[PDB]
Chains A and B, each alone.
Chain A
Amino acid sequence: GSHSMRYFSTSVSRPGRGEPRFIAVGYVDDTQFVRFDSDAASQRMEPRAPWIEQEGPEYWDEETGKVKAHSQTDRENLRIALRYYNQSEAGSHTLQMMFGCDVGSDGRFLRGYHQYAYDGKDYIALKEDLRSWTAADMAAQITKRKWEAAHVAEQQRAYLEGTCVDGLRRYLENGKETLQRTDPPKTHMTHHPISDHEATLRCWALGFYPAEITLTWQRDGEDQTQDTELVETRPAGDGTFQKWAAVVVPSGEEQRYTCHVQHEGLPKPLTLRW
């Protein structure tokens, strides 16, 4: 399979309680490896995986410098957006940024990302071609015009195809044991009486990595999709993930249902039956 690196940054204004708080986190696939919190005491980029601690002081100094500059950029962008929309300074607003790159099983550049959201919704995004922008409203079109005039797409593409890829490859190598693993899901089924006419069948997947997984229910062989309760995939806390899907079943009909599990650490997809 392929791999990804992503940084997610959030800025949150708090009027009457000082300056906006800025949080940034770094991920390779579904493994966090760095954080920065503008409210914390260290004022440094900090490690959050074992395999990144081996990096020297030259690394923590340049990364801290780059992330602090970004925090100041987005603190001003919050002020700019307030003007573009003529919003009240008493309100609490949010600015989110996501950027990063995907490689293929050869380390070949597959795709790059560089996008902003304001108050939980798309603001401006670098298109898949890495050469123009998507602007989601009139305020974002002001920024689009400015960034076109200043060749920002060229600047960021250079980062995404060079630095971003070089870093991801270096992290994949340095953390091969943890990042280049798959853990297949351990699976089982639980049974929960509701009344005397109904019972919940729950299909479980535990201990898997990466997080992406598909769990479906069938009855005689046809999809039971809108009668299925399906929870969000959740972290165990040890680096693996968990998920379940459930269906309500009439008494005596348990044997009509099958659960189906797809995951990349599985050689073939699984079928489970009560």
Chain B
Amino acid sequence: GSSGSSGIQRTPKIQVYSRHPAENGKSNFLNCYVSGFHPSDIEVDLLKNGERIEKVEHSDLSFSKDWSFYLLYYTEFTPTEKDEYACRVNHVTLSQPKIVKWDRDM
């Protein structure tokens, strides 16, 4: 089965993190940055307690000097002590969607 991929494949590097250091009850932004990948088609979702958050926005598609692509997905949120957040990424180089949990110290 063919995939719709040409050229050397590069797996995305995934980071999930907040705009400002987290503080329960204060509004913040939850970011999922994916970078260094090829081809450019990619799927990113932010998860709140395992459920897709519905109006995440994202940067316009751009690329670095070495031609590999990067994208920022982001949504306003107000963290709490119990709510768990993650970023979920699908790309042709991954055997299944990758889930990266938000760690308030990363």
Contacts and interface: CB of A to CB of B under 8 A. Distances in A.
A/B touching: CB–CB < 8 A: yes
Contacts, number: 87
B72 A12 contact: no
Contacts of B105: 190, 192, 202
Nearest to B103: A192
A12 B19 contact: no
A159 B15 CA distance: 38
A120 B31 contact: no
Contacts of B2: 90-91
B60 A25 contact: yes
Interface stretch (A162-170, A218-226, A235-243, A259-267): A235-243
A238 B5 contact: no
Interface in B1-52: 2, 4-8, 10, 13, 15, 17, 19-20, 29, 31, 33, 35-36, 38-41
Contacts of A90: 2
Contacts of B40: 10, 12, 94
Given A23-B61, A94-B6, A120-B8, A237 B74 contact: yes
A32 interface: yes
A120 B68 contact: yes
B: contact size bracket: 20 to 34
A232 interface: yes
Interface string A243-255: 0100000000000
Contacts of A23: 60-61
Contacts of B17: 234, 242
Nearest to A15: B4
Interface of A: 8, 10, 12, 14, 23, 25, 27, 32, 35, 37, 48, 87, 90-94, 96, 98, 117-122, 190, 192, 202, 231-232, 234-238, 242, 244
7 contacts: A32-B59, A92-B6, A94-B40, A119-B6, A120-B38, A232-B33, A234-B33
